[PDB]
Amino acid sequence: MELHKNDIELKKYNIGVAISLGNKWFSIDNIEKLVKWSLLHTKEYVIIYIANSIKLSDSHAEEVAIRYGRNLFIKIKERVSLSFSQDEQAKIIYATWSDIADSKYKEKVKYLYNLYDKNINFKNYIENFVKEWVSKEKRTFNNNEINKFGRYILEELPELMVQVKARGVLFEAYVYPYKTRITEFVGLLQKGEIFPEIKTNILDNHPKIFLEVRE
């Protein structure tokens, strides 16, 4: 279980553990290993949160939080309190969607929504983007559902691109077990190599750092 470097071994960064809820890799055991690894490499804090989700709220990430995220967090809490010491546990912050989506975060998301409605190339790209992920599955989805799922990605896009506070705590890096199409996409966005207006409008020369950590 290691980082697939200098700054990390020097513990320059606080580390986020980004949980894709419903992704079969994110068993409690693999989540435990990620939190273990992050505790041993972090500058101070480890921030556990729900990163993606692939009507009781106007926000999909919020609806995910109250339907599934709370129960996941309760299971993580109980496991952590048996696997780690009192002092290690004090390094861990459980960031709900609300802890992350403060007013500054919501302005970025709003910018992306407006761009999704006005720029048809961006709409086409994010949409076709969803169509690939569902292409690897058995179920079908209509274009209206495809479009709904696209908006859900934009809600999570700022957290992947910019360094943001959770409960007042800034985490510069996050761990994830594998590269995904979203991480390559975010890579191009952060460089201004795709949809450069997004970099111009919502990024701030402090890019979120992506740390690939697996067995």
Numbering used by the authors: 1 to 4, 11 to 60, 70 to 230
Describing publication, verbatim:
Cyclodipeptide synthases (CDPSs) use aminoacylated tRNA (aa-tRNA) substrates to form peptide bonds between two amino acids yielding a cyclic dipeptide product (CDP). ParaCDPS from Parabacteroides sp. 20_3 (GenBank: EFK64745.1) produces cyclo(His-Phe)8 whilst ParcuCDPS from Parcubacteria bacterium RAAC4_OD1_1 (GenBank: ETB63777.1) can synthesise both cyclo(His-Glu) and cyclo(His-Pro)9. ParcuCDPS belongs to the XYP sub-group of the CDPS family, characterised by the presence of 3 residues: X40 where X is a non-conserved residue, Y202, and P203 (numbering respective to AlbC). ParcuCDPS displays a Rossman-fold common throughout the CDPS family.
Additionally, we hypothesised D58 was acting as a potential active site residue, within hydrogen bond distance from the catalytic serine (S26), which could be important for S26 to act as a nucleophile. In the common CDPS fold helix α3 and α4 exist as a single continuous helix whereas, in ParcuCDPS a flexible glycine residue (G84) provides a significant bend and change of direction, splitting the helix into two. β3 holds another important deviation seen in ParcuCDPS’ structure, as it changes direction (compared to common CDPS fold) at I56 to divide the active site pocket. This structural change of β3 facilitates the placement of D58 into H-bonding distance of the active site S26. The active site mutants – S26A; S26C; D58A; D58N; Y167A; Y167F; E171A; and E171Q—were also generated to confirm the loss of activity upon removing catalytic residues. Indeed, when the hydrogen bond between S26 and D58 is disrupted by mutating D58 to either an alanine or an asparagine, ParcuCDPS loses over 90% of activity, while preserving its structure. When the H-bond between S26 and D58 is disrupted by mutating D58 to either an alanine or an asparagine, the enzyme is inactive (activity < 1% WT). This highlights the essential role that D58 has in potentially polarizing and positioning the serine in the active site for substrate binding and acyl enzyme formation. Further investigation into the changes imposed by these mutants was performed by solving the crystal structures of a select few mutants containing changes to the active site or the pocket residues. The mutant structures were able to be solved using WT as a model and retained an equivalent fold to ParcuCDPS (Supplementary Notes 4 and 7 relating to Supplementary Figs. 13 and 14). Therefore, the disruption of activity is caused exclusively by the change in these few residues which appear important for the enzyme to produce a CDP.
